[PDB]
Nucleic acid binder design. Structure first.
Ligand SMILES: [Mg+2]
Lengths: 72, 188, 208, 206, 50, 218
RNA sequence: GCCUUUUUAUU
């Protein structure tokens, strides 16, 4: 998007933000994973950051979503 | 749905190639890179749009960050391919979050020559100007005051402004050119 | 071939408020997006009819430097807020307006009287036996040449145009004209550019 | 010509060898862009007349055009020190490195944050700054000249003829190896234009 | 000597003259210095340096 | 709210022409004067050379035997050539010039619809008597400006579809007629001569009014 | 299909 200052206040560290957004982008590319955000015509780079703008995607709650996919 | 006929579609340059292209480059980060990088700000990412002419339109606000004027300097450009490298360009290498310099507390985004010159001609005080000593309802009315041409850009008037930190209002001595700035600055 | 030109689709028509609006005309011809925005800019600021106050008459106040007693308002603020009044009249051109207030309290545009066809669409902003005259005017007049207030005759407050590149899959560097505007609310901002369209069209019926 | 110049500007063209300088003065008889003849006067002659073959649209060292245009009319007498034909970027003996445009030292809505130039469409229209770049595409044939690959730009000889509007990415000179695989050269993208002349030297184009 | 040369032509003695804007149509409050300054195209072209 | 009328057209020559726009209101003379100035330079129907096909010489750089002016500067004189067509957008014109004498624009054979308003325009100069030139001048009608990049012997040139060259407008004082806020606007047009200056303001106002119909749609 | 020197030129 325009700026990333709203997504960095939810996680803190900037390099932890790239790790959680890359794993969110891998699920949106190969294994489906339709996002909870309203889908627009932008690419998956902005969708990986728009989910952290309100705080529905974090580095702690993405690992429990990977284990939820492994149980199914 | 192949690799052989897709090369023929690119080299033919028909109408359907550019509509595919603007979807890819709508929000793709692209690293603009000077060939001498003696500073950290020599590599900055951008979200480009498709234009005519084979030259890159490097932003003037980051022109002082590159420490390189538009003197005909030929310099590189780079893209990240994968999505874990594109997020490195948007969260770290973008020109939006590169405001402050790593060297000092002053920002590296400093208006150097022309945009500061347009700001300096507005923020000035002149006597015997067109429309000297008139009231204005707000800062947005100064755009109406200047574009019609009945008043000068620099005239000692009293404009109403709304300052924030919650909103306070006072009638202070403010010229016509400084009243253009109040619609530009944020609230706080 | 020479008479056919690009017509905009008028897709992005958004309004952040009832007064402020940002429209987008895309696509346009190269070199046309600046001249279609600048000509309709000066029409809305200098060549359009409107309604505003003309003269202020306060009891005991004949100069611009005075102080009112009994109310929590000054002279320099009482003619400034009245300049940006969202006043509109359609039946007659010149109309008078009165204001009656008693006691200690704030004055606004809600408790005032209409006195006929005068309509007030913004009663929330802050503005005694004060009589003012509201007449029809074109554009904007100053208070320096009238030698007793400047009249904000045009209903719009600010209009700026920006032009970016547009793509029509056959040509390049075409103009994409956006227009941000904010008015007093007497007319609609979608109708404000439409009113400037009929003003410019009435000047071209003798040529066409 | 430069609207503001120096008195040295008349001396660079008459001292350069790429600008045609007449060895003997006199009137002219036939003024062409290919060659100009000068009728030698009775005092300048020793007979006959001299000839001056003007190099028209030849390749320079930096892949740039060099052409010698005439500056005198028919029946115009010249002296020994005069110029009969201006060289490249020259007119009437004055060195014209560029063109005098109406320069306004002011910014216009951007485009002048640094010392870059905002130019008119009139400059693009009247060809006031468009130049000619003549690139060389040499063909080392160690390798037959026939273009039998396993087009319209050839004259059935494997060599492109004079005046073909080539495009970046087509075959220019056919060169196959005796084996049959195609390993010839092509024109790169972005230099699409017409051919001045195809110099074949050591078979119909030769 | 240049200001004396400007008195010969129809244009005034001052080096900067008032003129209108292209996309706006308004006369500048500060006159700019127009003129036929000699410019030249270099060898570094964008068709070869891209 | 006053409709301007073309009440007077003063032409000192076929190149430079001046029209009058009266009556206009105050604040609208700079508005309508700038809006008509931009569109006249943006897109107007002008006739210029698009393709040249010369017998003998194939491409646009090879010099021809028997001429004086270079063949690349011949196309510059063809770009300065002002022609006007009436009913057909594609026309074919020929030179067929033989003998001594400079090649002028009046030597070009024109049809009943093709009219050259500048007969003193010199294309090139011929110094050889027996040598002659003959080209196929192809002129298209369009607007704006197109490059030469966008038929071996038919050499491609760039076409400049701009029938005007410079537009001069200024706001002057008009007559009163018992009304204030009234000013005079004149427009001086230095044209190539293809379009009528009375029709130059009229056709530029048609494409201005057609672009304002989308402003009615919003 | 390249590589290395040398020269010119650019920031
Ligand atoms: Mg530099």
């Amino acid at each position: 998007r325009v700026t990333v200052q709203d997504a960095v206040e939810k996680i803190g560290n900037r390099f932890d933000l790239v790790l959680v957004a890359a794993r969110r982008a891998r699920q949106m590319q190969v294994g489906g994973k339709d996002p909870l955000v309203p889908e627009e015509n932008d690419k998956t780079t902005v969708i990986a950051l728009r989910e952290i703008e309100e705080g529905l995607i974090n580095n702690q709650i993405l690992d429990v979503r990977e284990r939820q996919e492994q149980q199914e | 749905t192949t690799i052989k006929a897709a090369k023929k579609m690119v080299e033919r340059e028909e109408a359907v190639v550019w509509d595919i292209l603007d979807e890819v480059i709508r929000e793709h980060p692209v690293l603009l890179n000077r060939a001498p990088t003696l500073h950290r700000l020599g590599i900055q990412a951008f979200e480009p749009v498709l234009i005519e002419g084979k030259a890159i339109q490097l932003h003037p606000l980051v022109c002082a960050a590159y420490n390189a004027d538009f003197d005909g300097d030929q310099m590189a450009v780079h893209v990240p391919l994968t999505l874990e490298a594109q997020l490195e360009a948007r969260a770290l290498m973008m020109s939006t979050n590169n405001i402050l310099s790593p060297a000092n507390g002053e920002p590296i985004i400093v208006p150097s020559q022309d945009v500061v010159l347009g700001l300096y001609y507005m923020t000035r005080d002149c006597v015997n100007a067109k429309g000297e000593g008139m009231v204005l309802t707000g800062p947005k009315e100064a755009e109406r005051l200047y574009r019609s041409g009945l008043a000068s850009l620099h005239a000692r008037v009293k404009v109403r402004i709304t300052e924030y930190e919650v909103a306070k209002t006072s009638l202070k001595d403010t010229t016509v050119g400084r009243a253009i700035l109040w619609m530009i600055v944020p609230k706080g | 071939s020479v008479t056919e030109f690009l017509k905009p689709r008028l897709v992005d028509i958004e309004q952040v408020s009832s007064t402020h609006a940002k429209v987008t005309l895309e696509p346009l011809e190269r070199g046309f997006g600046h001249t279609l925005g600048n000509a309709l800019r000066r029409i809305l600021l200098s060549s359009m009819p409107g309604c505003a106050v003309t003269e202020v008459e306060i009891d005991g106040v004949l100069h611009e430097y005075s102080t009112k007693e009994g109310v929590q308002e000054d002279i320099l603020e009482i003619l400034l807020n009245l300049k940006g009044l969202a006043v509109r009249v359609q039946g007659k051109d010149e109309v008078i307006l009165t204001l009656n207030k008693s006691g200690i309290g704030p004055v606004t545009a809600a408790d005032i009287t209409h006195d006929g066809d005068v309509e007030i669409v913004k009663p929330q902003h802050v503005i005694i036996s004060m009589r003012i005259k509201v007449q029809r005017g074109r554009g904007y007049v100053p208070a320096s040449t009238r030698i007793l207030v400047d009249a904000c005759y045009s209903p719009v407050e600010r209009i700026a145009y920006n032009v970016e590149a547009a793509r029509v899959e056959q040509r390049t560097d075409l103009d994409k004209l956006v227009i941000e505007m904010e008015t007093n609310g007497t007319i609609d901002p979608e109708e404000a550019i439409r009113r400037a369209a009929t003003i410019l069209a009435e000047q071209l019926e003798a040529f066409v | 010509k430069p609207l503001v110049g120096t008195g040295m500007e008349r001396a660079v063209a008459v001292d350069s060898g790429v600008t045609a300088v007449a060895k003997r003065g006199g009137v002219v008889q036939y003024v062409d862009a290919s060659r100009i003849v000068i009728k030698v006067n009775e005092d300048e002659m020793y007979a006959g007349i001299d000839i001056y073959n003007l190099t028209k649209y030849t390749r320079s060292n930096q892949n740039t055009c060099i052409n010698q245009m005439p500056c005198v009319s028919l029946g115009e007498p010249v002296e020994r020190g005069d110029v009969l034909a201006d060289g490249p970027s020259t007119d009437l003996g004055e060195l014209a490195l560029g063109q005098n445009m109406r320069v306004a030292f002011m910014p216009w809505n951007g485009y002048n944050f640094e010392d870059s130039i905002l130019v008119s469409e009139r400059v693009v229209q009247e060809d006031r700054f468009t130049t000619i770049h003549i690139q060389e595409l040499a063909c080392v044939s160690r390798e037959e000249i026939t273009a039998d690959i396993p087009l319209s730009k050839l004259d059935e000889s494997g060599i492109v003829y004079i005046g073909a509007e080539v495009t970046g990415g087509d075959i220019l000179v056919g060169k196959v190896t005796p084996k049959v695989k195609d390993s010839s050269l092509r024109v790169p993208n972005g230099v699409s234009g017409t051919v001045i002349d195809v110099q074949v030297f050591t078979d119909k184009r030769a | 000597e240049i200001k004396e040369l400007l008195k010969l032509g129809d244009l005034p003695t001052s080096g900067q003259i008032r003129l209108y804007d292209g996309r706006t149509g308004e006369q500048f409050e500060r006159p700019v210095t127009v003129g036929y300054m000699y410019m030249l195209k270099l060898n570094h072209l964008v068709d070869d340096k891209m």
